Design a protein around this ligand. Sequence first.
Ligand code: BCL
Ligand code: BCL
Ligand code: BCL
Ligand SMILES: CC[C@H]1c2cc3[nH]c4c(c3C)C(=O)[C@H](C(=O)OC)c4c3nc(cc4[nH]c(cc(n2)[C@@H]1C)c(C(C)=O)c4C)[C@@H](C)[C@@H]3CCC(=O)OC/C=C(\C)CCC[C@@H](C)CCC[C@@H](C)CCCC(C)C
Ligand SMILES: [Fe+3]
Lengths: 238, 301, 281
Amino acid sequence: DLASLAIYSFWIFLAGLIYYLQTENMREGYPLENEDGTPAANQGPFPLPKPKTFILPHGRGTLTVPGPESEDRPIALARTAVSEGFPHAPTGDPMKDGVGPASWVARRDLPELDGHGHNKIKPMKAAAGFHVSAGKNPIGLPVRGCDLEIAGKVVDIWVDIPEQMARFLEVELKDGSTRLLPMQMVKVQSNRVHVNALSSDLFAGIPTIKSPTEVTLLEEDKICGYVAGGLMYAAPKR
Amino acid sequence: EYQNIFSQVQVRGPADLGMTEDVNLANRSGVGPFSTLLGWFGNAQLGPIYLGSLGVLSLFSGLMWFFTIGIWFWYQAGWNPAVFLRDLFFFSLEPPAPEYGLSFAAPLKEGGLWLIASFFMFVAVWSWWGRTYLRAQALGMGKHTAWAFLSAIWLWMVLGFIRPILMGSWSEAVPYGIFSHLDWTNNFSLVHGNLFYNPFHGLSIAFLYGSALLFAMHGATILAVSRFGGERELEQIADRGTAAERAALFWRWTMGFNATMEGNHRWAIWMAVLVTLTGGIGILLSGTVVDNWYVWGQNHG
Amino acid sequence: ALLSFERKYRVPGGTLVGGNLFDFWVGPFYVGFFGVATFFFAALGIILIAWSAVLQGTWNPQLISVYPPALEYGLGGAPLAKGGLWQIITICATGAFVSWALREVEICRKLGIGYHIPFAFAFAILAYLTLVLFRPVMMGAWGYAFPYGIWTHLDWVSNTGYTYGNFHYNPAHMIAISFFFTNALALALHGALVLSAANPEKGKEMRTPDHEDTFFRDLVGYSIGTLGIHRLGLLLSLSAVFFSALCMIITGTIWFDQWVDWWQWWVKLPWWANIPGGING
Ligand code: BCL
Ligand code: BCL
Ligand code: BCL
Ligand SMILES: CC[C@H]1c2cc3[nH]c4c(c3C)C(=O)[C@H](C(=O)OC)c4c3nc(cc4[nH]c(cc(n2)[C@@H]1C)c(C(C)=O)c4C)[C@@H](C)[C@@H]3CCC(=O)OC/C=C(\C)CCC[C@@H](C)CCC[C@@H](C)CCCC(C)C
Ligand SMILES: [Fe+3]
């Protein structure tokens, strides 16, 4: 009857759908590779999809996935066992080398742009009409790291213009230079900002940005990468 | 260690009037107020809304639906404020008795009011559907919202219009009341042999639950990777960063497979849409084709 | 075996117990100490379910069911075949769940991301432990918990509910359902928004968060924003499961009559209890 016809068609439609959905989520990271960068033997039962191309808004180009894949960058790691399946030790300093939880990707070295084609993220000082509107304003607070030692002072907040939110604190070092800390890895307390991922001596180590009113996607990754990595790697000093 | 559920600092600049695309700006209002409260959680800006014609048709019959049910409730209260408030959840605007079949000839005070209210609802929902398509068209955006909303419309259509029609009467449709509609629901199950035997019901649940599962996963994942700008999903789609990478990898190490930043949204749209898709067939088949889900289930056909 | 961008993350470290002993993968799967714990509990659990199946006499999975000790045993143990298996299978389940959560924490630490996922999972675990441990204990018997079988646990859902009339009138249950439904709405919208921007009209260029905000302001006069919606889905989700647990923790313990009758408190308030007309005068 009609109902057993409907339920049985549905199970089929649902298999088709899982299929579509599963291949659709292969537009990235595939094909699978062995530990050495080589195409793996067994790829799974799902084929890659026919490619798609997104048109990028600001004469910024194209993305066509799936496509040829690569880190466009060295990986300071080496094998620690004699077969597939084990960890790969950092060959140098994992924070400095951006591996493990300090990793970053070779994202594009320009800034995300808003819908109007302007930089999405600006230091508040360059952002017309933008001020702190609720909560404790961190600007001027000393920044203290997980060793409980002061590593600098907050000198501006970098804001997302179209979404009107804090995204970084720009912090000044003994140096007189500055660094971005991601807004999401800091505690704004009443008389200080607390940063648990890093100890005071690792602030200098934060990747730096090439211009003081822009960040590029690439730079953002090296920054976020670095400070998250600190949770594992600073933890001795902590 | 901070968790990104509430913002620590809010930040305000000039009110955002939004992208002009092909939108007719004659029709956007002006900005509303800025809510500091809202802004601990999400955006602080209220407005501007776009209203124009189809918008107005919609807002109007919406209100008319609501005030139809509203005068009947006050009537049922014998015009007494104290009673109204007391018995708010017990008032109910029922459809025509089974004797009037599909005809619009029922007395106002015994189901005519129901059809009137239903009429206002029908145009409020559909016009709103159109608004869903058209606000997208004007921005140059794809039509996903409207298609997804269509899934919701399906169940609602089936409950109050398509199923009562195939069944031969309006008495079969759902009343307007807080408690009465729960009764209608329990009673619907009972009369049809227990909806737990309706395999579309069972699927429906899997999706409903599955939505809570997915959105909890997805939300949690994004917050977890939001220290790498994870929430800026579109730009992670156009140029994968470590946020999209470490989110895929968490799932991949946990359950052995994983999604892409764009692919996850397809899982989401479908998980949710399938709840009502599913559900609507479930109901549609009931009484029109299966009279008892237990019974049907015994011969599997 | 590896995603194209995956090696740079497969570093040592992050473990909670065992140091580097179980720090390794199996194909895509990370193996905690807690990977081993979950395998151990899940294997046991499954074996004892296959066992319980033969003592009941089927290898068909639409029929296999494992009941808790009948009410007569209270909170004590009970022979394997009359619901001890259920007790050990339950302990196994809990082992596997908490383990899976804890494995997740380790994956979190290795990746240097936040703990939000296992924290969310923890609410589901907590819902489970309400049906199988907290409610049955506040009630005096493992018999009140639900049995392990595809169809038979639905039977329990219907029997437990109808013990209180139409379970719809459970007010915490109303609130939870409200969250489940809203969650789904949110999910449909979130997915459709993001996708409607990444896949615009055709030959047209990718839209932006700015467009997504625009579309929602145009539509309803408000847009919660890309961070907001993720905060939201999380909150709606978890709130649904909180109120589920809450609606069942109170049933059979602090309320045990017909849920419909609870509402008498509102209608029988002094200021209006007695006025005539309406449904209740
Ligand atoms: C939550 C309140 C009630 C309940 C009420 C219902 C109702 C009502 C229904 C279900 C349905 C289901 N429930 Mg139940 N269910 C309960 C608790 C559970 C628990 C548990 C460990 O606590 C589990 C594992 C299940 C599992 C199931 C599935 C067999 C089915 C689809 C669920 C789903 O898609 O969710 C969302 C999750 C996903 C999409 C992730 C995938 C989950 C998969 C499918 C789970 C497989 C379970 C497996 C068969 C049993 C494990 C044995 C293993 C070998 C160890 N229920 C409690 C007692 N459940 C539906 C059904 O169709 O039943 C026939 C249905 O109508
Ligand atoms: C005792 C009662 C019966 C029962 C009888 C029914 C009946 C009857 C139905 C369901 C339905 C469902 N039941 Mg059942 N259900 C039972 C037990 C359960 C249990 C359980 C026991 O644990 C669960 C988890 C569920 C779960 C579910 C859902 C999966 C499904 C509804 C999906 C949905 O999103 O609807 C909510 C979404 C909508 C209704 C869409 C509405 C959208 C419209 C267009 C928007 C209107 C808005 C309007 C304009 C006003 C807006 C005002 C605003 C403020 C602006 N049922 C028992 C067995 N169940 C439905 C279903 O699909 O079944 C197959 C249904 O009809
Ligand atoms: C006739 C029956 C009654 C009724 C009686 C009950 C009863 C009784 C209960 C509910 C519960 C619920 N009902 Mg009610 N309910 C009715 C009508 C409805 C309707 C409706 C449309 O009418 C709806 C929408 C709901 C909705 C709800 C939810 C609030 C809740 C179910 C979700 C949950 O708790 O998840 C919580 C989720 C879990 C417990 C899942 C746990 C997952 C665990 C942690 C992991 C498992 C992993 C798995 C084993 C591994 C699989 C292996 C893989 C395959 C690899 N009810 C009717 C009136 N309802 C339940 C509740 O509130 O529970 C607290 C409950 O007990
Ligand atoms: C609001 C919280 C929502 C939620 C969140 C949630 N679920 C989660 C997570 C999160 C955040 C995970 O991280 C975790 C995961 O890895 O997802 C892929 C998970 C998960 N939620 C799952 C299921 C699940 N979640 C559900 C619900 C929910 N999950 C809530 C709605 C449901 C429902 C609605 O019923 C189910 C069925 C799994 C896919 C996964 C957990 C996998 C896991 O814990 O693996 C360990 C155990 C095993 C592999 C084997 C089983 C162990 C044995 C002891 C035997 C069987 C036990 C017995 C109780 C069976 C019951 C029989 C049934 C017929 C009733
Ligand atoms: Fe998202």
